[PDB]
Amino acid sequence: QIDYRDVFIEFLTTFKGNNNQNKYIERINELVAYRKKSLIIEFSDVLSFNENLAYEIINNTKIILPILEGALYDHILQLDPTYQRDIEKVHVRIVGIPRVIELRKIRSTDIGKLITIDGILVKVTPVKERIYKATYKHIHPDCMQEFEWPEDEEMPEVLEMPTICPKCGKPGQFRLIPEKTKLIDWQKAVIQERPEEVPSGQLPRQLEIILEDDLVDSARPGDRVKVTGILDIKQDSPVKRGSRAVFDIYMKVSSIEVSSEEDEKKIKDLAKDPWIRDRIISSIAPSIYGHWELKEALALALFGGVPKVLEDTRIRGDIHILIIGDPGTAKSQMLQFISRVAPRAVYTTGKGSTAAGLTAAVVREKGTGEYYLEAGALVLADGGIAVIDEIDKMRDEDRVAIHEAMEQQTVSIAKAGIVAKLNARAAVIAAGNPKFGRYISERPVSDNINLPPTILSRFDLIFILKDQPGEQDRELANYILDVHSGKSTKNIIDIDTLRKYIAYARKYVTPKITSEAKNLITDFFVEMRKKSSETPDSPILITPRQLEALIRISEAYAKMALKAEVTREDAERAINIMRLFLESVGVDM
Amino acid sequence: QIDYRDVFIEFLTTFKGNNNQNKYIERINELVAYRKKSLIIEFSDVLSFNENLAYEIINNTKIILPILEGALYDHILQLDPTYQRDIEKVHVRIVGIPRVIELRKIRSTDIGKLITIDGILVKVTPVKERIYKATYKHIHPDCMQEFEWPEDEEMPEVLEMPTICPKCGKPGQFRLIPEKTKLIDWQKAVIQERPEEVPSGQLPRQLEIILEDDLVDSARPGDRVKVTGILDIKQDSPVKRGSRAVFDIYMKVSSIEVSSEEDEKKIKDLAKDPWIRDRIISSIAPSIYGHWELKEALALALFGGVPKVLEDTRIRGDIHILIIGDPGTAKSQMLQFISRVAPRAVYTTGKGSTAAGLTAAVVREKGTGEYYLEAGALVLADGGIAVIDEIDKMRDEDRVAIHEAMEQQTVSIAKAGIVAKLNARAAVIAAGNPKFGRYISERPVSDNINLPPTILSRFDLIFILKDQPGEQDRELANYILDVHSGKSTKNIIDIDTLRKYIAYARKYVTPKITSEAKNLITDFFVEMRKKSSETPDSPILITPRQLEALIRISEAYAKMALKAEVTREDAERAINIMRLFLESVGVDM
DNA sequence: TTTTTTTTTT
Ligand SMILES: [Mg+2]
Ligand SMILES: [Mg+2]
Ligand SMILES: [Zn+2]
Ligand SMILES: [Zn+2]
């Protein structure tokens, strides 16, 4: 009614950034350079420019937003006429709204308003095409005319074809012409409330969201996203009666963000510390007294070695950890911590997981009737960490399903007429108890660990945690009580920035192995194998996998400090933690 | 015959509460401040002010309620004109009326009248939106005018669109405009009759209830509620012919209360008793001769310690109790009691429960065809108590499914392509028999208890109940016979108010640990660990869990006395019952 | 036919 297009262009051209940079003229120019079709504007900036326009953007979104998009398209097309004939429509995507609604707490009064929802994305569909401007043909030996049907408008959520020909005025048959039809990319996804938000004793709620055009395929299942958009009622057949006055809610999304500049500077400044490795290790599960070898090993597992992908084969880069320990030894608490700190992790329990749930499930969809594949835990954990607590509670017949994923990092299935293989490039961090609950030193290591060697060799480090009371006891109790009282530790790396640091290291640091490090690894591996032949009753074998583990561990020691080369220091650190592991499983060098 | 709006406004503004407080203008102020759209009035106050108004409220509800709501809306908007343009309708929810029909016993003549139903809420749907005034648009190259269709009325339970356009007079197709459409929150729930109401040998009946607007999400599954409302007939498709002359009954809810003020003074005055802990303990299972240590343990488990939720981890606050005893030692009876007295509790049997039924089940809902998550017992008991009777009757391979819930207080599953973890912050109180039905004193404690160390360490206190005949026998018999005769115990706390006291204490009392109590706990814990290192054969270990249990128990003794600090007395009481526990399983100190 | 589940059943 009162047009804001000039207001919007003045906002774009003149809104000064932080250093008088013209934040949005820079974003516009960069958009045109890379030919991206979507301009993101912060809502706080709009409220800082024109309060009235910001109100219209939130409350009258459906119609004020395309007008702004048209003004932006015109301005862009003046800036560079070559945008025409490449992109016909741009988007004005509003990000960072003031108030976020908790998914469960939306009510009637939130429909039609532009709102934000924070939640975990659990499911997406393939990419489809939605018609927004149809072109029909009246089949009749008189008309035979093509016409755009959603005239002066746009095709609604429901699909409706005309009943009266607007080109002649005579009813009849209408055939859809796909040649002269205009479509937009379309994807349905489901987001559910953050686990910390689910009320006591209830199950998490879900909400269906719709992503169109360049929003399609912008996040993977498991990603915690912050969607901005508009709510509406889900119509499956509303033109017919017979009760059913009730509807579901969905969000048409205009903006989405997952999980970023000062963070890089901070992680770099952190890694200038000559003792940064010790810092990270002491930052691992800080409310747990002791278990430094385990904190080190878990930190290594967080960082991981370097995967080698070649012309014929590929070689695993991820580090697997196994902690077999007495009851009450902070195992599950540490595993909970690393699932929290890791940039991408999945938490599973040996008794809570199936063979199919951990790898891939073949589910018979009761709709079409046909069989389809669903990603299990190790596949969703691709690119991250999968934690298997209480791994001795898995059925062995179920547990062997992860052997392929642990070494070749693929889950390959051939079932119900479908043959496929998925990537399960996930690092396994596992914990369990010995055969008799606690470790029994009176018995050989073999019948006490009670795991096959085929899976033991898959583990780079295997520590046996014995809970033996000694002089440590008093210290322990004091530490625990200080934890209960609320006395947190100082000079630590907070879990969020530790996560950001791990993510950066994994994304950007690929350490190369130096010759001196390679010589130390070979020499220690030979010594390892010679000592291993001395006790063949041990179910802990020394295989080429252990040489690869020395590689991966030294690579991760380098990675942890952000180093681009694996120097002698990192090789020695690897040999030493390896030697600790071997001492615990009863192997003296 | 009398304009009841003036009477109602007089009731609100001038009704003196208990201490001449003007109860309802104060409730109006709180409602207007927090911008809530619903004012609760007790029916007894209305009957105490104006019998004729109360009679009109219950008997002539259908028309009297909107008039009163309009009067209240006018008054509210006079209090704060900013209420305008935020909320157009207020709610007058009358609570506690004396027209309470038992669920099974409703009949025809009770339809249309305002009645109350006391029952357990078992199932709810997600929160949906029911249209209550649609706005259509006539699609035709001549009309194209917008109009609200349910004109001069409101959309009925069935959804009906017009057949004739009122803006032109021409029939055709009508498009729903969700923008100009009016919606109300909608939620279907199921309530079933109280177990004391279920006829002999039959199954409990159920009834469908509908909660709209702010009534939505006002109770969780498991809650015993008292729903007030009006009954009506269920319509799934009634406008078309073809048989189906029979209808189901449901309640449109207007008011609901779960499970409330002077009780605070009652429990506070109770807590001034210098021996209040002994009173509570003697109020536990009053019909059972002896077993006072178990009664104490159950009282502690009812109260529970303080959970610590920190930056990285969280630390369990609930107290787990295990009673392993000879047959016929009043175990099941005491457990039944604590399930009755606990403000929220779940009762299960080792042979009656699954590993999936106790934690969480992956159910293939045959409607959507896809796999769905269902809360098991330990998840439903979040924030309360779950009692596992006959726990020795579980398969061990099934029982380990609760280990995670017992320590980390989450049930996490990964199956059929879905990964989730729910909160299971419930205290487990379990009982079972020894390996040989009765305890065998000629055989070691290890194979007599017949439980893994991994589950035993999860239990803060484990009592071995032997039924050995001595001088106790005659006293026992006399107590039993008096119980049969109907001679109840004096100087007792009735179960209903003891439940209320427990509720208040758990909700509001967070005991802090003093330095002296912490030092006492540390010393005793070190003594425990040395004494345990003396006995390496037992299945009862001493792990960090036992130190955490001393923390929880002393915290709970303070909580039981409503103390805000953990004094030396509470630490000493905790240490002594721990010492008793250790004596029963066989450790002298 | 696969999968989780409770159940009767090859
Ligand atoms: Mg554990
Ligand atoms: Mg029994
Ligand atoms: Zn025509
Ligand atoms: Zn019309």
Please name the residue that has the structure tokens 């048409």.
A252
Query: What is the CA B326 to C1' C6 distance in angstroms?
Result: 31
CA distance A359 to A568: 38
Give the up-direction half-sphere exposure of residue B255: CA atoms within 13 A in the CB hemisphere: 22
Q: Which one-letter amino acid corresponds to residue A106?
A: I
Q: Nearest nucleotide, C1' to the C-alpha of B414?
A: C4
Q: Detail the DSSP E strand segments found in A69-113.
A: 91-95
Structure-block tokens of residue B12: 């609100």
CA distance A232 to B449: 59
Structure-block tokens of residue B211: 């909660």
Residues 156 to 215 of B: which have CB under 8 A from any A CB? 156-161, 172-176, 178-179, 181, 183-186, 213
CA distance A346 to A387: 6
B89: chain A residues, CB-CB within 8 Å: none
Beta strands B418-423 and A512-513 are unpaired
For residues A259, A262, A264, A265, the Cα torsion angle rounded to the nearest 10 degrees is -160
Assess contact for A413 and A420: CB atoms under 8 A.
yes
CA distance A161 to A176: 9
Q: Tell me whether B217 touches chain A (CB under 8 Å).
A: yes
Q: Which nucleotides of C are covered by protein (CB under 7 A)?
A: 1-6
Q: Which residue among A199, A235, A485 sits closest to B513, beta carbon to beta carbon? A: A485
Calculate helix-pair angle for B495-508, B331-341, nearest 10 degrees.
Answer: 70
Size of chain A, expressed as the number of residues it contains: 589
* Largest Cα span, chain B: 101
Structure-block tokens of residue B436: 């040989």
CA distance A537 to A41: 66
Q: Which of B221, B254, B204 is nearest to B121 (CA)?
A: B221
Three-state SS at B155: coil
| DSSP, residue by residue, B277-345 | HHHHHHTSSTTS-S-HHHHHHHHHHHH----EE-SS-EE-----EEEEE-TTSSHHHHHHHHHHHSSSE
CA distance A486 to A506: 33
The answer for residues whose C-beta is within 8 angstroms of residue A205's C-beta and 6 or more apart is A103, A104, A192, A193, A198, B126, B127
Give backbone dihedrals phi and psi of B583, rounded to 5 degrees, phi first.
-65, -40
Nearest CA in chain A to B156: A245
Whole-number Å distance, alpha carbon B145 to ligand 4 midpoint, is 6
Beta strands B182-193 and B114-124 are antiparallel
Run of H or E including B14 = helix B4-14
**From the CA of B37, how many Å to the nearest CA of chain A?**
13
Query: What is the CA B149 to C1' C5 distance in angstroms?
Result: 48
Resolution reading in Å: 3.2
At CA A65, angle to CA A61 and CA A66, rounded to 5?
Answer: 130
CA distance B283 to B334: 12
Check residue B144 and give left, alpha or beta (phi > 0: left; psi -120 to 50: alpha). left
A156: chain B residues, CB-CB within 8 Å: 175
Structure-block tokens of residue B400: 């380990």
Say whether A238 and B159 touch across the interface (CB within 8 A). Answer: yes
Query: Terminal CA-to-CA distance of chain A, rounded, Å?
Result: 84
**From the CA of A13, how many Å to the nearest CA of chain B?**
33
CB atoms within 10 A of CB A325: 23
CB atoms within 10 A of CB A174: 18
Three-state SS at A282: helix
Three-state SS at B577: helix
Distance of CA B330 to the CA centre of its chain: 27
Q: Which domains does chain A possess?
A: 4-95 (3.30.1640.10), 129-183 (2.20.28.10), 263-585 (3.40.50.300)
Query: What is the CA A296 to C1' C9 distance in angstroms?
Result: 53
Run of H or E including A249 = strand A246-258
CB atoms within 10 A of CB B220: 18
Structure-block tokens of residue A58: 């939130």
CB atoms within 10 A of CB A104: 17
CA distance A223 to A121: 6
Please name the residue that has the structure tokens 């157009």.
B88
CA distance B301 to B560: 10
Cα distances (Å, whole numbers) of residue B12 to A562, B39, B76, B256, B346: 70, 11, 11, 21, 41
Q: Which long-range contacts (CB under 8 A, 24 or more apart) does B580-586 make?
A: B580/B293, B581/B297, B581/B461, B581/B462, B581/B463, B582/B528, B582/B531, B582/B540, B584/B462, B584/B463, B584/B464, B585/B445, B585/B449, B585/B462, B585/B464, B585/B538, B585/B540, B586/B445, B586/B535, B586/B538
CA distance A281 to A561: 11
Three-state SS at B385: strand
A138: chain B residues, CB-CB within 8 Å: none
The partner residues of B349 in beta bridges, in order of sequence, read B389
Output the CA torsion sign for B137, B139, B140, B144: positive
Query: What is the CA B357 to C1' C5 distance in angstroms?
Result: 10
CA distance B114 to B61: 7
